[PDB]
Every structure is written in C-alpha cells, then in structure tokens.
Amino acid sequence: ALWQFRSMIKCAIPGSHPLMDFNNYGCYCGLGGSGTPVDELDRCCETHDNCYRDAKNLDSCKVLVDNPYTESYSYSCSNTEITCNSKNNACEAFICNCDRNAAICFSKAPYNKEHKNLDTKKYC
Amino acid sequence: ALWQFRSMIKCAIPGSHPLMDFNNYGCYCGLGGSGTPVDELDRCCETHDNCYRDAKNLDSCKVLVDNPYTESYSYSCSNTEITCNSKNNACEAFICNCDRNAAICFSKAPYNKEHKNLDTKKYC
Ligand SMILES: [Ca+2]
Ligand SMILES: [Ca+2]
Ligand SMILES: [Ca+2]
Numbered sequence A, B: 001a002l003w004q005f006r007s008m009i010k011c012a013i014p015g016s017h018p019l020m021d022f023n024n025y026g027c028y029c030g031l032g033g034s035g036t037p038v039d040e041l042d043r044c045c046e047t048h049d050n051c052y053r054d055a056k057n058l059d060s061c062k063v064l065v066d067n068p069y070t071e072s073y074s075y076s077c078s079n080t081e082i083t084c085n086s087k088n089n090a091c092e093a094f095i096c097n098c099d100r101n102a103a104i105c106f107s108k109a110p111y112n113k114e115h116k117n118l119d120t121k122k123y124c
Helices: A003-012 A018-022 A040-056 A059-064 A090-106 B002-012 B018-022 B041-058 B090-108
Strands: A077-078 A081-084 B075-078 B083-084
Touching: A003 A018, A003 A077, A003 A090, A003 B041, A040 A059, A040 A090, A040 B083, A059 A090, A059 B002, A077 A090, A077 B018, B002 B018, B002 B075, B002 B083, B002 B090, B041 B090, B075 B090
Parallel strands: none
Antiparallel strands: A077 A081, B075 B083
8 A cells, every 4th residue: 555655665765755755756656657757766556657657457456456545555674675475366476566666766766856846848 | 364354154064155145235344334133144344343443443453454354363263163363463463353242243244135235226
C-alpha cells in the first residue's frame, strides 16, 4: 500500500519527505505518466508505473486484489535495506517488489529540482 | 478478501458452492443484516458481520486499511483445516480470523433450505 511505499523511501533515503519530494516530479512521478521521462528519477517512476500495470495482468492479482495502492503487504526495513517477506501471497509479493525496486531506484537517481512540478501539458 | 473466504468455505465443506448455498440466507447471510438471525447458520453470518465491523475499529485497520472485504491475506488449506499465516499484520490476521471462524461455523450449523431466500423485508 502507498503508506508502505512512503515508508520504504524513508528507509532507503533517510530524512526524505516522500510526498513532498517525489510527487509531481517530471512526467511520471504522480497520478499519470505520458511522454518521455525527463531524467533517471522520472524513469524510476515510469518503471514503477509499468510494474503496477504488469501486476494487474497476473491471475493472482485479478482474483485477490482490487487496488494495489491500498493492499497491505509484509516487508521490513533493516537499517537501510528493504526486504519483502517471502510469505506474502503472490499478488502482494509482486507489489512489494515494484515498490522496493522504485525506492532503491530513487536512492540512486540524481534529484533535479527544476523537474519538480514540471508542466505536464507542456512537456509530456 | 472475499475470494479467499469463498475458498475457505470450500476447504471446510468440500464440494459446497458458497455463493449458491450461503448468499441470501436468513437475515444476515448476504449484503445486509438486521433483525434476529433465524437459525444457527444465520447466527454465523451475523457474527461474521460484526467481526468485520470490529475489524474496522482496529487502529492498524482503522486508518491503514481501505476496506476489509478487499484486503488480501495469507492462509492455507491443509486437507480440511484452515490456517491463517503468521506473516499477517494485525489487520489481515483479524480478517483471516473472521473468515476462518465463519467457515468453521458454517461447517457445523444445520442448513434449513426453508431459510434460503427468506423475505428480508417481511422477516428481519
Ligand atoms: Ca505515475
Ligand atoms: Ca451480512
Ligand atoms: Ca494484504
């Protein structure tokens, strides 16, 4: 669930303010995604968006989960490392994974303040 | 999640058709619940209805869980026994239990074919 994803980003990026820093950044980080991602951080959001789309194609996600952004999974934050519980169901494990990889992705991408709140009709 | 509860009913009552047999039975098995339950099977539905109402008032569920009929959990069916997996968080464990106790409840109550499709306006 989204609240878990916000906590994974604080895990990997201590002292980050997830909603404030990464929402509405470039063409993909936020409600939609269209156009060409404008940097490596936007590309992280674009993969996370496709990750969620692919999860919805799994049979497991179809019968068991309604909304990925609301579905709680099991993961842990050890120090700065994220781990998805091996005992999560197959749909929960796929979501957990998408989130884990995005979080690790954001921790290595450079942040471009200029891309924050970019006009999505103009540039995307 | 509802698909999981249907599955636990077929675990405990091998060969039942959960929607066909248990939906729209007495006063509580179905969308609503009002009145006095008409029999033991109906009291199972009633308890499961209250179970979920309590689930919602659980802090970890309270704010952190969208809707309990939607949240997926981990459980397993061994032969005819249901087990809620220990990986589940407070919210999911609570849900899985509401579900597990109802399926066991159903497996033990007597079924009055005469209460299937009881007029809810008239009798509840
Ligand atoms: Ca997006
Ligand atoms: Ca009911
Ligand atoms: Ca779950």
